[PDB]
Amino acid sequence: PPPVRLFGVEGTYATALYQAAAKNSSIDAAFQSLQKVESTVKKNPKLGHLLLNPALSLKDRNSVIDAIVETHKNLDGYVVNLLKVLSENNRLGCFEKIASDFGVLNDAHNGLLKGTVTSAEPLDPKSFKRIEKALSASKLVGQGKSLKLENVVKPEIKGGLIVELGDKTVDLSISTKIQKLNKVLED
Amino acid sequence: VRYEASLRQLEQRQLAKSVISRVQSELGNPKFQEKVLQQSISEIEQLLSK
Amino acid sequence: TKAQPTEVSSILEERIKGVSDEANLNETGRVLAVGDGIARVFGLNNIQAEELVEFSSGVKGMALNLEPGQVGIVLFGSDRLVK
Amino acid sequence: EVSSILEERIKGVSDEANLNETGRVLAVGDGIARVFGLNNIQAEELVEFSSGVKGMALNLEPGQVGIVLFGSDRLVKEGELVKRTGNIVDVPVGPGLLGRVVDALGNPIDGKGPIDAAGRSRAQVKAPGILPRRSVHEPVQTGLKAVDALVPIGRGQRELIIGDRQTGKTAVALDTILNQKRWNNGSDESKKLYCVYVAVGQKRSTVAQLVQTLEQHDAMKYSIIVAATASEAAPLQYLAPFTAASIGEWFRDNGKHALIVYDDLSKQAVAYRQLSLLLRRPPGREAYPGDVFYLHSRLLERAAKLSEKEGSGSLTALPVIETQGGDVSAYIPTNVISITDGQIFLEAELFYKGIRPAINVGLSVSRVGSAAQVKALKQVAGSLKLFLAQYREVAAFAQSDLDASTKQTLVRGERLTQLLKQNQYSPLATEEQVPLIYAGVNGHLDGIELSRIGEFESSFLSYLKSNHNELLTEIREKGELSKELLASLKSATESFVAT
Amino acid sequence: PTNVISITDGQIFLEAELFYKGIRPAINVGLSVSRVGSAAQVKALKQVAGSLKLFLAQYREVAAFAQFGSDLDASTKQTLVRGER
Amino acid sequence: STPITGKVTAVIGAIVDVHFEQSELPAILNALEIKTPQGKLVLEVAQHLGENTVRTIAMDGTEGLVRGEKVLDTGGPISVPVGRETLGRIINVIGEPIDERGPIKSKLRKPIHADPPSFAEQSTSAEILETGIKVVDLLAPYARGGKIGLFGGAGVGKTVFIQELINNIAKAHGGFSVFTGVGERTREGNDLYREMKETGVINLEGESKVALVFGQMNEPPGARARVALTGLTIAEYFRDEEGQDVLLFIDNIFRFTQAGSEVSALLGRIPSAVGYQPTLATDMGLLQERITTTKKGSVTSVQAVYVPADDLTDPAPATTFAHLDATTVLSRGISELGIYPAVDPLDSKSRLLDAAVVGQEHYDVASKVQETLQTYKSLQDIIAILGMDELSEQDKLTVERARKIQRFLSQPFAVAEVFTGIPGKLVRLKDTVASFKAVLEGKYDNIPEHAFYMVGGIEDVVAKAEKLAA
Amino acid sequence: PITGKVTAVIGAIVDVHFEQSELPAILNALEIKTPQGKLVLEVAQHLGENTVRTIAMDGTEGLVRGEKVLDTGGPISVPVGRETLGRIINVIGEPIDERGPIKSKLRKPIHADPPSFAEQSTSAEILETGIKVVDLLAPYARGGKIGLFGGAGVGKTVFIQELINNIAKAHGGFSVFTGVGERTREGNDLYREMKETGVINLEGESKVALVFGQMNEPPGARARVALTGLTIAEYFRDEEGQDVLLFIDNIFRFTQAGSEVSALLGRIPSAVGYQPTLATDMGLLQERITTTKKGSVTSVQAVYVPADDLTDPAPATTFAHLDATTVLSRGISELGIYPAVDPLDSKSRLLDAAVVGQEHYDVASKVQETLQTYKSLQDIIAILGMDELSEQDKLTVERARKIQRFLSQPFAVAEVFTGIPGKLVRLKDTVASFKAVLEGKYDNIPEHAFYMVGGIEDVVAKAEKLAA
């Protein structure tokens, strides 16, 4: 079965969509349409995102689907079969969730990886580049896979860095070292 | 002897709260900035060794 | 939240794949998860209640629970036979 | 200096390398963190949270790994990094743990400094098989006359100390530990049982008493107290006998002898119950977890008298079970009773009737029993078993017009019962067990007044020591009573009775 | 029942057998207790009923002995006679 | 990060789940205040359910709540006020004065959760309280720093005993005491407040050698659970920061177990045996382990326990039974015998009651009492059918002695003047050992059986012999 | 090539996710290569989506989700043969006797269908048992389940040993002592004893084959040990024709084990916490055991009744399967009688008159009536005095004490242990012996000439020797 299996419902949907469109080898098309519909949900911010709430019927839901393919009939069609399915299963609150999840699967198929450099403050671009280079250089990025290394600001972590990718982290941060230090002086 | 041991525990706890004061001083300094660079280059060395 | 027989990934994948006429399944089924001497079969849409069904594995069972989108057969025979 | 020790400690921190698998807590409730990450986790592996809390991973679920926090829930919080220690539960084992009161992690809770240990061995190590054992043939004397004669205790064997709540159950056990000092003092490794007392769910106040009594009787120098106190959390409580067993296994592996006293598995049961119910694992009988039989059986089968190919060693064990209203019917008692090989059943009524040890002879059994009884002691106490048996039957006849035969039984029986009273926390050497019982067997004690039995006992012993400590030394060293010794002993008793 | 018993200041247990025995109200005196106790009854009535509780309890104890058919001495039968009345 | 605010999502009962806003993560065992028309409702954070939705337990009654109501986080455990300014004030669970003497002047505050002192730290000595209550003194003497336990069931004159105990032991000992009432009736509450104002222990002018924390059973199940925890911390302040020995008193600790059982259910945990919480052991353990004598103060808890349906084999009393150092059982049967104290002599036991501890003489006298009574109990079945004249001659004297001893245990209470009229007799410890010894020796086996009833020591018995003689 | 990755290890219930169209069947055996050798998991559900749910037979310690799994393709196949005689074999069919790899020709699945109705033997026939007591008052039967009752303290082990010897003489059979959840301590003793009594003689030939199930083994392996043993028996019976007798140890521990596996599988336990599959699990075990045309198993089981309760469901289900009960007692052993069989409590349901022959039935009935009366007489003989009771009564007492002694047999197996030459008595001669005693033809011969003797022929000798 296609690489990367995202456990959990709604990602059971994503997995299905992913695997189905991988076997139809039209993942770029799917992804593109998913971005577009995700965008048109976001760009229908009231009265089409604020009515993803359940309350509507099956029959009222069907007319929501019709409105969705009315906004742009540039949809892939496998994702239109998915839209019907989501209507029938009467969930669409986790629609963009499924889209995001498909995105993870898709960009895994592309090979793209995401990382993180949580810090208390946004670091040098030099630091960003050096780490991206380093990670690509290191076996940590296997290559044939890319790194969107994202520094995030988490003031809660005081100074430091934590490099993250592939569920493998190196955490050289001041807070954590301080924790161990405080503890060693409680002895 | 009993009071001597008690006094040692008390001294250690006095110095413990003094350590908290030093921690606050350290996090005040732009050593807070400069050591981020230290962590960065050290991690470059670490991650390259992987 | 919930799980449905259509949420089962093989079922789900066929529906996405456009196919939904789903062979002769509306009078035949193909077994889903099985064990505990009861089997949950997908299809059998023309099943009568308490019908006798024959599994292709040389065993027959009586449909007991006709459920939304699934039928839960009860196996009259050894578990090992059904898969 | 206080400065120097602190300076050493700060100096002892320095650098790190890649944290192999992070986790992020998804939800933490009830000490059951459910973690997203830890992809390659080993079953029941030790994992370290951000808070420094340690955990085990009892449930490895299809997308979350259900860590069980060893610590308090307060310290852990959602989204925490969950570093993977990468070492399945193992505890230091070695020789240095003697005289060290350690908790389950092995951290000295008495601050007797870093453990000296020769290995860290897993606490899930599986027992020695059928052929890796050789049948019991080595006594362990407990210094309690009744235990040693009525229900003789061997090696590698297991017998319950199953009895009513807070009848000073621990006291009956503690006495055994004290008697091991005599044999311990000797140099022969044959004569060395390195006892391990496993305090499960026991309040820190109790452990303070334990510590002081053991120190007072100088017992610490062959004792280990594995301590899982009441406060200590349900993972620790669960793993506490398992951890303890591993320590025992090291001694056993060295081919030495040792006695591990699990007190009480009833609190172990409660901990497993807490874990399972909180982890939503299928519940079972008497609201004890479904696999509670499996837990108790795993622990209790570790105890083994090893084979000569495995250079005969032992790990004698004495599980303690606390009966709730004396109900042997109760699920946790029934299971343990089945698993064990013998039971000693202390009885509250007897305690109240001032018989201390309050062991109820009827409900005490040994299934290894007399196989590992001292030969001397065996000789002089076959009679004793039968007399007491009769005394029990003729007990109800103690209400007037009573047959001479019944009255004979009663006199002999009452005196014996009085003789088997002992002041707890004073163990009695086998070389002094053998004379006292001989007297009773020869019924010379029947004549002695009931009130005077206590006085008689000490006097007989002092008299024997004055009169002929040569005989006593012979009894100790030969260990087998020759006809000449049995002759001399009868004479000695007669002579003593005369004074 | 367990929950309520803890909550309440007294319990006034009745017994079915005593209803049939013809004690109406069928109050089972031994199981009936008042935790808050006397300071809510007439002073006079407190005086008269001073040993009434004790007598009834003694009657109960005696009654048990009486049904084991053991020979009853006159002192026991004073209790018994008082108790019956 | 955004200002710490939570929106209620579900009030399902006491359990009220709040939906804190993203990236601010409240922590397990924090304290939330929700501004309400009636004070600030306190919710104790007890689980994280992810997505910044916490599940919290209420401490004040929950009604009228509107899903979405802004929730401030005061963080960490509920913070009480502590001081010697808490002396002589009744402090409700959240910490507000319910003694209505206006604001309690807070010196320091402390969390209501604190980890029990470690084994190395915990230093416990054996020292002996003198109760002056004869049955207690001989057959289970109490010990300073202990975890004394007033086990009893329904209506064992539990309050009467406690009133006597406070009257004797509390007043007698210095230091501090802390009177904590967990989930008890407002009838009992009003009496306890009044009685200790009356005895002047709560001296409204001058310091009171006691503080009060009254939690009553009208309070929500949640509030009932953490009232105990609250009280413990007041004692800890005394133990630690004031250094003084504490004579803690809690009432009734079955209510503490019971309360915990309820919020387990509400927390949605799978019910354990006889519906009790699966966390029962660790919760009981946490409370008891926290209560101890340290190298600083010596906290001496005296804890009432209510034994449901006089079955002490029931897991909740039985679990408590282990953790308490110096048990006292008050039995229904003994109450009916009219013996006040209603302490059952056979079942009362205290760790200190060993010759090496309480002295050989004390031990020997008590050994004679215990055996005699136990023999007497054994013979009762025989006596029932067969009669007195079928037993041994020795036994017949033992029965007569046992009957004399049995009613010697009835030593009037000084607070049962109020309930009845009997004047209490506070009989000294040295004297009590002496008084029991004499009877057993048969030195007063010429004195009638009924002259041991409802009187103090031997001296009182001789006087009472004269009273019967006349 | 059917391989899958472990995708859960919640408890000892390990869910394995298999690659597509390569899905094991229910009751397949999966082997996970481990540093513990292998871990054998048995597929007991299919959870669908190409995932299964399995149970474990070895400890599930340090498993990593992502371990490679290999599918055997069906129930564990355990070696069988006369080769496998005298080998202690663990549940997974591997030597734990440590005398090296078991040489074997064929291996056979541990689950096996119970013989068809066609294969059933129309009417049960007696299985000769050297113990005279067994053959008089409660005969064994080929096919049958005869449940030994009363644990060790009756010389249970020697009795079990005696039976092993007897079957080998009786037919030529073999045996397999299967011990279900036996204490490892007891197992050591049995192996040592069996070696000593030469029933197992590794150097020589070993009648009994051992399957020992230690309590340490996980509940799943505790449940499966019995079925494994049964397969071995079936190879002897069906495929070597030899009649065999398959002992089971506590069948309580069979039930107990089954209850756990159910609970682990998440199936709601039934009344008194006994598995919902309680009837079926005993049913599979106790109908495989039967009388085939080829051969016949006969099974002696030990029933450790739980808390001496016979109305508990585990006993009730057990009693349904049982055909006869041999009730060893310690009282009997205290009357110096080894056999320890309690004659008045031993009962068989194949004691039936038609089945055992009318003459045999009548002889047995007389001996039973005599014993029943003897017991009642001994009650009042003690109180009243022997001579203070009828001439007719003391004729009965006289007759009885001789029968009581006549029951004693010095066992062949314990020829070594006691030093007394063995006695194995043939069925015809058992009937003959009691007939003669009933006609009191030897009711001249003193009581102790009957103590520890063999057949009628034997006690002629003893009468002469007693005089000499």
Statement to judge: residues F47 and F138 lie in one domain: no
- Cα D327 versus chain centre, distance: 21
Residue of F nearest to E60 (CA): F336
Dig out the tokens for F334 from the structure: 């003994």
- Cα G228 versus chain centre, distance: 14
Statement to judge: residues G377 and G429 lie in one domain: yes
Nearest-neighbour CA in chain B from D43: distance (Å) = 27
Residues of chain A with Cβ-Cβ distance to C3 below 8 Å are: 9, 12
As a whole number of angstroms, the distance between CA D103 and CA D89 comes to 14
Q: DSSP for G283-310? A: HHHHHHSSB-SS-B--EEEE---GGG-S
Task: Please say whether the beta carbons of F87 and F113 come within 8 A.
Answer: no
**Quick check: B19 and A178 CB within 8 A?**
no
Dig out the tokens for A111 from the structure: 């090979």
Backbone angles phi, psi at D102, to 5 degrees: -130, 155
As a whole number of angstroms, the distance between CA F181 and CA F217 comes to 10
As a whole number of angstroms, the distance between CA F34 and CA G200 comes to 79
Gaps after residue numbers in chain F (C–N over 2.5 angstroms) = none
CATH number of the domain that D27 lies in?
2.40.30.20
Instruction: State the number of CA atoms in the 13 A half-sphere of F123 facing the CB.
Output: 8
Q: Do chains D and G touch (3 or more CB pairs under 8 A)?
A: yes
Statement to judge: residues F73 and F211 lie in one domain: no
Q: Do chains B and E touch (3 or more CB pairs under 8 A)?
A: no
Statement to judge: residues F396 and F263 lie in one domain: no
Statement to judge: residues G449 and G388 lie in one domain: yes
- CA distance to A83, F85, G173, G198, per residue, from G164 (Å): 73, 85, 9, 11
Residues of chain A with Cβ-Cβ distance to G20 below 8 Å are: 1
As a whole number of angstroms, the distance between CA C16 and CA C19 comes to 7
Backbone angles phi, psi at G410, to 5 degrees: -85, 110
As a whole number of angstroms, the distance between CA F336 and CA A84 comes to 78
Residue of G nearest to A16 (CA): G49
Q: Which chains does A contact via 3+ CB–CB distances below 8 A?
A: B, C, D, G
Residues of chain D with Cβ-Cβ distance to G260 below 8 Å are: 290-291, 293-294
Angle ∠(G324,G328,G329) on CA atoms, nearest 5: 140
Q: Which chains does E contact via 3+ CB–CB distances below 8 A?
A: F
CATH number of the domain that G14 lies in?
2.40.10.170
Statement to judge: residues F153 and F53 lie in one domain: no
- CA distance to E6, G181, G264, G347, per residue, from D290 (Å): 33, 17, 7, 37
Matching residue, tokens 């592939």: A166
Task: Please say whether the beta carbons of D59 and D82 come within 8 A.
Answer: no
Task: Please say whether the beta carbons of D248 and D193 come within 8 A.
Answer: no
HEC sequence for F114-138: CCCCCCCCCCCCCEECCCCCHHHHH
Strands (E), C1-83: 29-35, 38-43, 52-55, 59-67, 70-76
Residue G84 corresponds to which amino acid? T
Peptide bond into F341 cis (omega under 30): yes
Is any Cβ of chain A less than 8 angstroms from the Cβ of D95?
no
As a whole number of angstroms, the distance between CA C46 and CA C49 comes to 10
Residues of chain D with Cβ-Cβ distance to B43 below 8 Å are: none
Dig out the tokens for G8 from the structure: 């859960």
- Give start and end residues of each alpha helix (H) in F29-153: 134-139
Question: F153 among the known binding-site residues?
Answer: yes
- CA distance to D358, F353, F413, per residue, from F350 (Å): 17, 6, 21
Task: Please say whether the beta carbons of D308 and D101 come within 8 A.
Answer: no
F371 is catalytic: no
Resolution as reported, in Å: 4.4
- CA distance to E74, F381, F399, per residue, from E66 (Å): 12, 14, 20
- Cα D450 versus chain centre, distance: 34
Statement to judge: residues F87 and F162 lie in one domain: yes
Statement to judge: residues G29 and G102 lie in one domain: no
- Give start and end residues of each alpha helix (H) in A23-171: 27-42, 58-70, 78-88, 96-110, 125-137
As a whole number of angstroms, the distance between CA F121 and CA F297 comes to 12
Q: How many CB pairs under 8 A join C and G?
A: 33
Least Cα distance to G277 among G257, G304, G307 occurs for G257
Q: Which chains does D contact via 3+ CB–CB distances below 8 A?
A: A, B, F, G
Where on the phi/psi map is residue G283: left (φ > 0), alpha (ψ -120 to 50), or beta? alpha
User: Exposure string (b/e) for G224-239, b if CB count within 10 Å is 16 or more?
Assistant: bbbbbbbbbbbbbbbe
As a whole number of angstroms, the distance between CA D270 and CA D257 comes to 30
Residues of chain F with Cβ-Cβ distance to D325 below 8 Å are: 313
Least Cα distance to D317 among D241, D420, D380 occurs for D241
Residues of chain D with Cβ-Cβ distance to A104 below 8 Å are: none
Task: Please say whether the beta carbons of A120 and A159 come within 8 A.
Answer: yes
Q: Do chains C and G touch (3 or more CB pairs under 8 A)?
A: yes
Is any Cβ of chain B less than 8 angstroms from the Cβ of A170?
yes
CA quadruple G381, G382, G383, G386: dihedral sign:
positive
Helices (H) and strands (E) in chain D, counts: 16, 18
Statement to judge: residues F208 and F85 lie in one domain: yes
Angle ∠(G96,G100,G105) on CA atoms, nearest 5: 100
User: Exposure string (b/e) for F231-246, b if CB count within 10 Å is 16 or more?
Assistant: bbbbbbbbbbbbebbb
Which residue in the list F44, F184, F195, F236 is annotated as catalytic? F184
Q: Which residues pair with A113 in a beta bridge?
A: A147
**CB-closest option in F28, F113, F370 to D76:** F28
Q: List the domain range (segments joined by +) for residue D447.
A: 374-499
Statement to judge: residues D32 and D135 lie in one domain: no
Statement to judge: residues F120 and F196 lie in one domain: yes
**Domain boundary, last residue among D321, D351, D373:** D373
HEC sequence for F257-313: HHHHHHHHHHHCCCCCHHHCCCCHHHHHHHHHHHCCECCCCEECEEEEEECHHHCCC
**Quick check: G46 and C80 CB within 8 A?**
no
Is any Cβ of chain D less than 8 angstroms from the Cβ of B7?
no
Residues of chain D with Cβ-Cβ distance to F284 below 8 Å are: 230
**Quick check: A182 and B32 CB within 8 A?**
no
Dig out the tokens for F165 from the structure: 């105990």
Q: Is G254 exposed, middle or buried (0-12, 13-18, 19+ CB in 10 A)?
A: buried
- Cα G415 versus chain centre, distance: 23
Interface of D with G in 418-447 (CB under 8 A): none
Q: Which chains does C contact via 3+ CB–CB distances below 8 A?
A: A, G
Nearest-neighbour CA in chain A from G85: distance (Å) = 47
CA quadruple F454, F455, F457, F463: dihedral sign:
negative
Which residue in the list G5, G82, G156, G330 is annotated as catalytic? G156
Q: Which CATH number fits domain A11-110: 1.10.520.20, 3.30.70.980, 3.20.20.70, 1.10.1280.10?
A: 1.10.520.20
Please provide the size of chain D in residues: 499
Q: Would strands D119-122 and D196-202 be described as parallel, antiparallel, or unpaired?
A: unpaired
Least Cα distance to G175 among G222, G127, G103 occurs for G127
Element holding B46 (H helix, E strand):
helix B31-48
- CA distance to A150, D79, F101, per residue, from F25 (Å): 22, 9, 38
Residue C76, classed as helix, strand or coil, is strand
HEC sequence for D117-151: CCEEEECCCCCCCCCCECCCCCCECCCCHHHHHHC
Please provide the size of chain G in residues: 468
Rg (CA), chain B: 19
Q: Which residues pair with A148 in a beta bridge?
A: A114
Is any Cβ of chain D less than 8 angstroms from the Cβ of B43?
no
CA quadruple F328, F329, F334, F338: dihedral sign:
positive
As a whole number of angstroms, the distance between CA G87 and CA G102 comes to 8
Question: G155 among the known binding-site residues?
Answer: yes
Q: Would strands C38-43 and C52-55 be described as parallel, antiparallel, or unpaired?
A: unpaired
As a whole number of angstroms, the distance between CA G211 and CA G76 comes to 15
- Cα F347 versus chain centre, distance: 18
Residue A107, classed as helix, strand or coil, is helix
Residue D141 corresponds to which amino acid? Q
**Quick check: D77 and F123 CB within 8 A?**
no
**Domain boundary, last residue among D69, D87, D105:** D87
Statement to judge: residues G128 and G245 lie in one domain: yes
What's the longest Cα–Cα distance across chain C? Answer: 37
Question: G40 among the known binding-site residues?
Answer: no
Is any Cβ of chain F less than 8 angstroms from the Cβ of D279?
no
Residues of chain A with Cβ-Cβ distance to B48 below 8 Å are: 134, 137-138
CATH no. of C21-83? 2.40.30.20
Residue of E nearest to F157 (CA): E35
Statement to judge: residues D239 and D321 lie in one domain: yes
As a whole number of angstroms, the distance between CA F23 and CA D245 comes to 45
Dig out the tokens for G159 from the structure: 């009795």
Residues of chain C with Cβ-Cβ distance to A91 below 8 Å are: 1
Statement to judge: residues F382 and F337 lie in one domain: no
- CA distance to F150, G3, G179, per residue, from G55 (Å): 50, 17, 21
Nearest-neighbour CA in chain D from B22: distance (Å) = 14
Residue of D nearest to F113 (CA): D74
Angle ∠(F382,F385,F391) on CA atoms, nearest 5: 40
Q: List the domain range (segments joined by +) for residue F9.
A: 2-77
**Quick check: G46 and C33 CB within 8 A?**
yes
As a whole number of angstroms, the distance between CA F131 and CA F466 comes to 28
CB neighbour list of residue G67: distance below 8 Å, 6 or more residues apart: G5, G6, G32, G33, G34
- Give start and end residues of each alpha helix (H) in F61-200: 134-139, 158-165, 171-172, 186-198
Q: Which residues pair with A164 in a beta bridge?
A: A116, A169
Residues of chain G with Cβ-Cβ distance to D338 below 8 Å are: 304
Residue G20, classed as helix, strand or coil, is coil
As a whole number of angstroms, the distance between CA F413 and CA F417 comes to 7
Strands (E), D155-294: 161-164, 196-202, 225-229, 259-263
Is any Cβ of chain F less than 8 angstroms from the Cβ of E36?
yes
Nearest-neighbour CA in chain F from E68: distance (Å) = 5
Domain total for chain G? Answer: 3
CB neighbour list of residue G146: distance below 8 Å, 6 or more residues apart: G138, G140, G298, G299, G300, G301, G322, G323, G324, G325, G326, G348
Least Cα distance to G264 among G90, G11, G15 occurs for G11
- Give start and end residues of each alpha helix (H) in chain E: 2-7, 16-20, 43-48, 52-66, 74-84
DSSP state of D289: B
Which residue in the list F185, F295, F443, F467 is annotated as catalytic? F185
Dig out the tokens for D371 from the structure: 């196989």
Dig out the tokens for G146 from the structure: 């005869």
Interface residue ranges in chain D relative to chain B, Cβ cutoff 8 Å: 2-3, 6, 17-18
Is any Cβ of chain G less than 8 angstroms from the Cβ of D386?
no
Dig out the tokens for C25 from the structure: 């399944």
Task: Please say whether the beta carbons of F142 and F214 come within 8 A.
Answer: no
* Experimental technique: cryo-EM
CATH number of the domain that D249 lies in?
3.40.50.300
Question: F387 among the known binding-site residues?
Answer: no
Is residue D406 a part of any domain in this protein? yes
**Quick check: G267 and C36 CB within 8 A?**
yes
Is residue D328 a part of any domain in this protein? yes
**Quick check: E36 and F187 CB within 8 A?**
yes
- CA distance to E40, F44, F229, per residue, from F41 (Å): 39, 10, 18
Gaps after residue numbers in chain B (C–N over 2.5 angstroms) = none
**CB-closest option in D3, D6, D17 to B46:** D17
Task: Please say whether the beta carbons of G165 and G423 come within 8 A.
Answer: no
Matching residue, tokens 């040890």: D357
Domain total for chain D? Answer: 3
Nearest-neighbour CA in chain B from A120: distance (Å) = 10
As a whole number of angstroms, the distance between CA D141 and CA D160 comes to 16
DSSP state of A114: E
**Quick check: G49 and C35 CB within 8 A?**
no
Question: Which residues of D carry out catalysis?
Answer: 367
**Domain boundary, last residue among G350, G365, G390:** G350
Least Cα distance to A134 among B34, B35, D21, B42 occurs for B42
